[PDB]
Design a protein around this ligand. Structure first.
Ligand SMILES: CCCCCCCC/C=C/CCCCCCCC(=O)O[C@@H](COC(=O)CCCCCCCCCCCCCCC)COP(=O)([O-])OCC[N+](C)(C)C
Ligand SMILES: CCCCCCCC/C=C/CCCCCCCC(=O)O[C@@H](COC(=O)CCCCCCCCCCCCCCC)COP(=O)([O-])OCC[N+](C)(C)C
Ligand SMILES: CCCCCCCC/C=C/CCCCCCCC(=O)O[C@@H](COC(=O)CCCCCCCCCCCCCCC)COP(=O)([O-])OCC[N+](C)(C)C
Ligand SMILES: CCCCCCCC/C=C/CCCCCCCC(=O)O[C@@H](COC(=O)CCCCCCCCCCCCCCC)COP(=O)([O-])OCC[N+](C)(C)C
Ligand SMILES: CCCCCCCC/C=C/CCCCCCCC(=O)O[C@@H](COC(=O)CCCCCCCCCCCCCCC)COP(=O)([O-])OCC[N+](C)(C)C
Ligand SMILES: CCCCCCCC/C=C/CCCCCCCC(=O)O[C@@H](COC(=O)CCCCCCCCCCCCCCC)COP(=O)([O-])OCC[N+](C)(C)C
Ligand SMILES: CCCCCCCC/C=C\CCCCCCCC(=O)O[C@@H](COC(=O)CCCCCCCCCCCCCCC)COP(=O)([O-])OCC[N+](C)(C)C
Ligand SMILES: CCCCCCCC/C=C\CCCCCCCC(=O)O[C@@H](COC(=O)CCCCCCCCCCCCCCC)COP(=O)([O-])OCC[N+](C)(C)C
Ligand SMILES: CCCCCCCC/C=C\CCCCCCCC(=O)O[C@@H](COC(=O)CCCCCCCCCCCCCCC)COP(=O)([O-])OCC[N+](C)(C)C
Ligand SMILES: CCCCCCCC/C=C\CCCCCCCC(=O)O[C@@H](COC(=O)CCCCCCCCCCCCCCC)COP(=O)([O-])OCC[N+](C)(C)C
Ligand SMILES: CCCCCCCC/C=C\CCCCCCCC(=O)O[C@@H](COC(=O)CCCCCCCCCCCCCCC)COP(=O)([O-])OCC[N+](C)(C)C
Ligand SMILES: CCCCCCCC/C=C\CCCCCCCC(=O)O[C@@H](COC(=O)CCCCCCCCCCCCCCC)COP(=O)([O-])OCC[N+](C)(C)C
Lengths: 659, 659
């Protein structure tokens, strides 16, 4: 993606880089013989190794012999070098190397060997055989004492990113499962020493590991769905799918964290009909008659009742790709729609009314202020009591403004740094609601010091206040697009047109202000291009189309003053301004193509954020789901959902081929 | 493409155009007999030719006999006329003509015959047989003494353009190779007299010739890739692919010169695994484990270390079609990205800073000049020393401006004439950087003559100077499009709208200025349409939308003055101006569809142009690549590149059909 990785030492190297002595020719000539496939040259070199071991001090002969078979810079052995280079005669050089280590008491050490390298640590001879797809060499090595629980930890086998390495699950069972080799997976699970409930350095197990390697888009061949079904259904218990890693996530919650929509649909809709495996399912269909059916969903680690539920991960954590496609799955779709009809319509309506009456009060009191030198109060709370009836509206300003500044200021403090790179993560409205409430109470405090700059701050509070009414247009679908593409346009288009337009507004502004002469004879001010600040204003009025091409200029070089104004009008009114209108037209077109996807993801935040304001006795009232016994000795919560599907049923009936 | 060619004399003609005598009927009747396929009439005419040769002076009888078989206007013989017209009985009239020339000592002359025509010179009887796909007549002619090294040079066999003729490689081996006939190619390479390392008049050989005939786009059947592999791998040496033609190019460098992207990808990625043919490859993969792999590339005639490298041909020589598609190939992609991280980010950042401070100095000194009659210096270098601290900024203008005018003026002098027909060949910024630096030093020299027209030249230097800051927006991808489509629009759209708009600005300008009368009673100037120059200005202010439809005109025919203004506003404000905005909208749309292709090709020029400023000890430091021994007795430079490809690997594993 970004950059290719660097590795400090290569795993295998048959390319010699640039810059009869038995202590050199024994060790080096075996590696080259076993790599090319010279069988006859190999037996003639092994019998020379035991010749040096007879002229050696006793009781240390296995330690001396392994040093002449293992490398020193890395822990790669003769059997590892043999299996990385597959030849047509590697079935027999395994037999010859296994026979040499059986003649000594070194067979247990020669197979269970590990790399000592910092970058390839823990890799054994089973990892090379399962990688190179040698199915019959694997059965021999298990039958000779290979550890089937060896973990391969390292910088290569556990990277930081999805590139820069190759993560598969760190066990030999997970390597066979992530390489689409179903027969070796059947082979290891039928062995007694295989620990299925095993965990790696990330805390993952085999079901966590298959989620990380799955495709985030639906395609034709999906072997990670058939491997998740195959390994789960053989264990026949609950310990795998209820286990948490170091981040505290199940296999179900890691699919919603990473964004895999096809693995998520499979787990929420499992239904197994055989009697010993009935209890593993999460959906229970009890009656169906034509198109209609009734079903029960599992709802255990899904609904908003514990921490890190799958309804809360999908909504709040943007940068996940498929968030609309997952919120329309079936246990999730009914839960959001039920929370809207039961308490969320009415809390969203009271927020619109307590804010619309806040702005009518703050406007009528600011507009109708006493405009005299002899009458100067601040228009708030009756700080000087003139005793007029219903003064509570002036009290209602300072009460409701200090509530918003406390509440929204906490929400700015709780912002993730990924919440500032999405429009849908509504971090714009947390800023602007805060600064409108600060300026209200700042203007009240500056009258108590009587500075008479309160009116500069009270005017800006009315203009932001009526501009924040654009938040509440997400209640309707039709008006919910205009608050979105007023923000796509002002970031993708206007802040890139701004840097180009200052270069032409600075350059011609200094140039036109340097060609004039001082016209103040007796305070005439004939020249409208006198200063730098006067010339930038008259050039802005000409891109808009409000100024004049006044040629009668009291200055030297009158024909050069015409050449530089007409060049400005062509570049910035005919060419640049009509260009930026054709860049707004491409942004507006793409928001309207996706108007439904954007409106539905803005409700789902407002539904789950009014739920965190409710008290606990009130949230316990609206809990949807009842206790239910779906099999023997197992109790769980459930939703009953009826579903009538006319288009799916009629295609099932027409295609049936009654002939 | 452009025009069909003309040929001075046809190659074969069976259509007689418009405007018993044995010296006429012997020669003419053989050609018509051998063309139609009259076998019995042919033997009755050959025995009449030897009757005339018995009544002839001796020792000259082969010279007399060939003149009655070869034509005179061209060198076409009886065997050539036989093979151009294929009949079902041309297997035997070859046998009859070969038997007649064997009875004399004229067999060596009768087969090895050449056209003497200016347009078809050198064409022999093997070229006609290999063209007409007669595979078994070819083996007979080789077995009778045909020259298999005859070159066919001529205006037809070596044209100027790709049309106007048919270039194939000028040898009989290249004709068989460029006509998709693999069996005749095997036939000639197994003959001993075949010179494989042979060159034609262009200097090309068989591997150069196959590059010129290849398709520049990837399609299904590509026989030129299978012929390049077939002929190279049989020679088994290095003389073919390291040979240069008259322009000094290898077969590798001619593919990048002509733009063939599929031949270029094949050569840079050859990998042959068998032991006698291991050494011919250019990529050496030494370890691979799942998706990741490590490889070594050849880098010999690719990297910027000699003249005409393939990294330098693709970048500088536009008019080549596939330049983005070739710069993303693998030895080329890593080299450009490595030169950016090691020295090119920092040289592109110092150029932005030494030019941005050049414009702040030249603006603040021009704007704050002494505006008095008693104070008139030139604002540069303290030509009159007033002794103010840090005068070095005024010195910094004339130093840095004379550097740019020398450096950019050399670059204008080194421009190819094809560099002035591409936006991406940045010949616009070589002009405008030059003229901004000339006007600075021109204004300094005109104060030394004290002409007081220096200020007309110093003002234009500020306006161009801030407009050249649009060059440095190619560092970012998002802003790198606005400098491009400000140039596509001002060439494809505005200079075509300009010729149409002058016709309506000239015609109505003279017409409206002829209907008025002189209003200067006592210097009133009531009529704003008095002159030609006054009327063109008031009509330009009305297309923009700044003028007035002032009907109160002090002139004769007042209702005709209304009819010609309203006709102008409809034609040029409602119709023409809104048309040109819909022609800018189609240009802006196509630049944004190709925004990534244009930004990436502008970096690649700036990377290779800061490299030509570095000194030789500094360029020798940043050389990337190490000496390496990839096979016996062969040393070469290499890059090691790691590559992890998740999408290619997982499709290889899912499609494997483990069943
Ligand atoms: C029908 C079936 C049952 C329905 C259940 C009903 C449950 C009722 C409540 C239950 C508990 C909730 C307490 C929340 C209070 C927080 C106050 C607040 O700041 O407003 C918050 C919400 O405001 C509300 O959601 C509640 C509105 C009623 C407030 C009750 C006190 C005043 C009622 C006295 C009546 C008048 C007295 C006389 C007045 C003249 C504003 O939050 P926001 O809109 O999200 O902010 C803008 C968005 N932004 C975050 C991006 C910036
Ligand atoms: C001088 C140097 C040369 C010039 C600079 C050159 C470099 C600049 C280039 C940079 C990256 C290139 C991408 C092009 C678009 C750039 C804009 C951007 O950064 O958006 C980024 C994220 O968008 C956001 O940041 C969302 C806004 C967060 C809330 C901020 C509130 C501001 C309050 C203040 C009140 C203001 C009121 C306005 C309302 C907020 C990236 O956008 P994107 O990659 O296209 O991804 C689309 C995702 N999207 C849905 C979020 C859009
Ligand atoms: C002069 C110019 C104007 C000013 C300019 C301002 C401009 C800016 C404003 C622009 C637009 C304004 C936005 C409107 C805001 C809310 C409306 C809304 O949400 O729409 C909804 C209607 O929902 C309702 O109408 C509320 C339900 C009844 C509430 C009854 C009172 C509460 C009583 C309880 C008191 C509690 C206890 C009391 C306290 C203790 C529509 O939703 P729906 O159609 O129903 O369903 C969704 C469709 N779906 C099913 C496909 C998903
Ligand atoms: C970090 C790792 C190592 C990095 C290696 C760093 C190597 C450094 C250098 C190494 C040798 C290069 C010499 C090039 C000099 C040419 C001068 C020139 O005209 O500028 C040229 C480039 O300018 C540069 O690229 C270099 C900028 C530094 C100049 C050094 C002298 C002044 C430093 C004293 C410091 C301040 C003293 C105090 C001042 C107050 C302009 O070229 P351009 O931008 O292409 O032109 C515009 C484009 N156009 C062609 C279309 C028109
Ligand atoms: C009176 C008679 C009747 C009217 C005339 C009728 C006949 C006229 C018709 C002619 C051909 C028909 C094609 C239509 C487009 C015409 C324009 C053209 O010639 O472009 C040609 C090449 O484009 C260039 O020349 C690139 C600019 C080179 C640098 C020049 C710097 C000038 C500095 C001065 C400063 C000025 C500042 C502005 C910035 C430079 C051809 O363009 P194209 O075929 O479309 O190929 C696209 C390739 N492209 C990527 C290069 C675009
Ligand atoms: C007030 C209004 C403003 C005025 C209006 C002006 C408006 C006009 C201007 C518009 C935009 C301005 C353009 C910015 C120009 C350079 C920035 C740039 O290149 O971007 C790059 C940042 O590269 C860097 O930031 C430089 C790296 C650090 C330099 C450290 C100082 C040098 C020290 C050494 C001293 C040497 C020795 C000293 C002397 C002897 C971004 O590139 P990237 O993201 O890093 O990678 C590319 C992404 N890729 C990997 C996909 C390919
Ligand atoms: C389209 C235009 C784009 C924006 C440009 C707008 C300009 C702002 C530019 C930049 C903005 C930031 C600086 C603030 C300047 C404004 C303050 C001011 O006006 O007061 C004064 C300063 O006026 C000046 O003379 C200074 C402005 C020109 C030089 C700017 C600094 C150059 C270096 C920056 C970059 C390199 C450093 C980076 C190094 C890494 C004006 O005083 P006065 O009017 O004479 O009043 C007379 C009365 N009196 C005598 C009693 C005092
Ligand atoms: C892209 C990000 C831009 C940020 C803003 C984005 C939006 C921009 C929108 C608006 C902001 C733009 C400014 C307009 C209003 C001027 C305010 C002012 O204080 O001027 C004053 C000072 O200013 C000067 O003295 C002018 C100095 C001349 C050269 C300025 C650029 C040189 C430094 C470049 C620095 C880097 C800039 C490079 C920019 C490419 C006016 O002074 P005066 O009239 O000369 O004196 C007359 C005396 N009198 C007052 C008593 C009568
Ligand atoms: C960014 C826009 C460019 C900025 C503009 C700078 C461009 C410069 C480039 C090149 C200029 C090269 C010529 C040298 C200057 C000579 C000075 C001179 O003659 O002044 C004379 C006038 O003359 C003029 O009117 C100005 C002539 C400009 C040439 C046309 C350039 C077209 C640029 C457009 C396309 C660019 C597209 C670029 C796209 C990015 C003096 O005036 P006068 O007649 O003596 O008046 C006295 C009258 N009296 C009789 C009453 C006393
Ligand atoms: C939208 C309009 C489009 C452009 C049209 C613009 C017009 C320019 C047309 C063409 C431009 C090139 C010629 C330069 C003319 C300008 C010089 C000038 O004005 O000075 C004078 C010449 O004024 C005239 O009278 C001559 C202009 C009209 C006829 C043009 C030539 C026709 C032949 C060309 C083609 C056929 C040949 C081709 C053969 C193959 C003006 O003098 P004055 O104002 O009377 O001053 C009075 C004071 N005095 C008496 C002391 C002197
Ligand atoms: C497409 C390429 C075009 C090139 C430019 C592209 C951009 C064009 C933009 C601007 C240039 C256009 C000119 C506008 C400014 C006029 C300058 C001038 O010198 O006028 C003067 C002379 O001119 C005359 O005398 C006018 C002659 C009348 C007929 C003109 C066309 C006949 C020849 C057609 C030749 C072929 C043209 C065919 C064109 C289709 C004004 O003279 P006056 O006012 O009459 O005298 C009053 C006396 N007084 C001054 C003392 C008061
Ligand atoms: C390029 C545009 C065309 C140019 C225009 C030429 C077109 C000509 C074609 C044809 C004209 C044929 C008629 C002959 C002329 C007679 C003269 C006459 O009658 O004048 C009279 C007025 O009369 C008028 O107002 C003008 C009549 C024009 C006819 C409408 C044509 C529509 C063109 C549009 C569509 C074209 C689309 C083309 C698309 C490219 C005299 O005026 P008066 O009333 O005596 O005023 C004195 C008043 N007072 C004394 C009472 C105070």
């Amino acid at each position: 993606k970004t950059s290719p990785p660097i590795f400090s030492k290569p795993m295998d190297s048959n390319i010699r880089q640039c810059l009869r002595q038995k202590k050199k020719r024994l060790k080096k000539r075996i590696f080259a013989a076993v790599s090319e496939g010279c069988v006859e040259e190999l037996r003639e070199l092994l019998q020379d190794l035991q010749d040096l071991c007879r002229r050696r001090r006793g009781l240390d002969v296995p330690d001396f012999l392994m040093h002449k078979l293992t490398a020193s810079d890395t822990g790669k052995t003769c059997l590892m070098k043999a299996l990385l280079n597959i030849n047509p005669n590697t079935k027999e050089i395994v037999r010859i190397l296994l026979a040499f280590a059986e003649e000594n008491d070194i067979l247990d050490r020669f197979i269970n060997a590990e790399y000592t390298e910092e970058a390839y640590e823990g890799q054994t001879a089973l990892n090379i055989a399962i990688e190179r797809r040698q199915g019959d060499i694997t059965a021999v090595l298990i039958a000779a004492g290979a550890d089937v629980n060896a973990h391969a930890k390292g910088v290569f086998f556990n990277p930081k990113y999805q590139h820069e390495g190759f993560y598969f699950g760190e066990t030999p069972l997970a390597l066979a499962a992530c390489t689409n080799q179903p027969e070796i997976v059947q082979l290891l699970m039928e062995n007694e020493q295989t620990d299925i409930t095993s965990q790696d350095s990330r805390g993952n197990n085999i079901l966590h590991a298959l989620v990380t390697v799955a495709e985030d888009f639906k395609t034709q061949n999906d072997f990670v769905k058939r491997m998740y079904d195959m390994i789960l259904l053989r264990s026949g218990n609950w310990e795998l799918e209820t286990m948490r890693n170091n981040d505290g996530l199940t296999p179900l919650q890691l699919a919603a964290k990473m964004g895999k929509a096809e693995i998520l649909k499979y787990i929420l809709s499992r239904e197994i009909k055989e009697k010993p495996l009935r209890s593993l399912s999460r959906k229970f269909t009890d009656w169906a008659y034509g198109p209609v059916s009734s079903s029960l969903y599992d709802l255990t680690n899904v609904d908003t009742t514990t921490d890190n539920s799958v309804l809360e991960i999908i909504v709040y954590n943007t940068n996940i790709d498929n968030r609309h496609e997952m919120l329309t799955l079936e246990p999730l779709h009914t839960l959001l729609h039920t929370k809207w009809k039961k308490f969320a319509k009415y809390m969203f309506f009271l927020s619109f009314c307590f804010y619309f009456f806040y702005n009518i009060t703050l406007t009528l009191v600011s507009y109708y202020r006493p405009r005299e030198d002899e009458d100067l109060p601040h228009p708030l709370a009756l700080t000087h009591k003139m005793s007029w009836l219903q003064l509570l509206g002036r009290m209602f300003v300072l009460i409701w403004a200090t509530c918003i500044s406390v509440k929204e200021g906490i929400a700015i403090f709780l912002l993730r740094p990924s919440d500032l790179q999405s429009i849908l993560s509504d971090a714009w409205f947390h800023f602007v609601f805060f600064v409108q409430a600060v300026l209200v109470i700042l203007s009240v405090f500056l009258y108590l010091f009587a500075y008479k700059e309160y009116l500069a701050c009270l005017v800006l509070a009315m203009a932001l206040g009526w501009a924040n009414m654009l938040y509440y247009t997400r209640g309707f679908q039709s008006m919910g697009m205009y608050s979105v593409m007023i923000q796509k346009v002002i970031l993708h288009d206007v802040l890139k047109f701004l840097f180009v337009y200052i270069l032409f507004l600075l350059g011609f502004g200094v140039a036109l202000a340097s060609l004039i002469e001082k016209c103040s004879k007796d305070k005439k001010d004939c020249s409208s291009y006198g200063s730098f600040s006067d010339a930038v204003l008259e050039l802005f009025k000409l891109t808009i189309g409000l100024g004049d091409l006044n040629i009668q200029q009291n200055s030297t070089y009158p024909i050069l003053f015409l050449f530089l104004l007409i060049t400005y009008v062509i570049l910035t009114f005919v060419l640049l301004l009509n260009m930026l209108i054709a860049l707004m037209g491409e942004t507006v077109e793409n928001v309207s193509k996706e108007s439904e996807r954007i409106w539905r993801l803005q409700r789902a935040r407002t539904i789950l954020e009014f739920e965190k304001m409710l008290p606990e006795w009130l949230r316990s009232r609206f809990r949807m789901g009842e206790l239910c016994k779906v099999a023997d000795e197992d109790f769980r919560l459930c939703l009953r959902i009826n579903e009538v599907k006319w288009t799916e049923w009629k295609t099932h009936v027409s295609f049936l081929n009654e002939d």
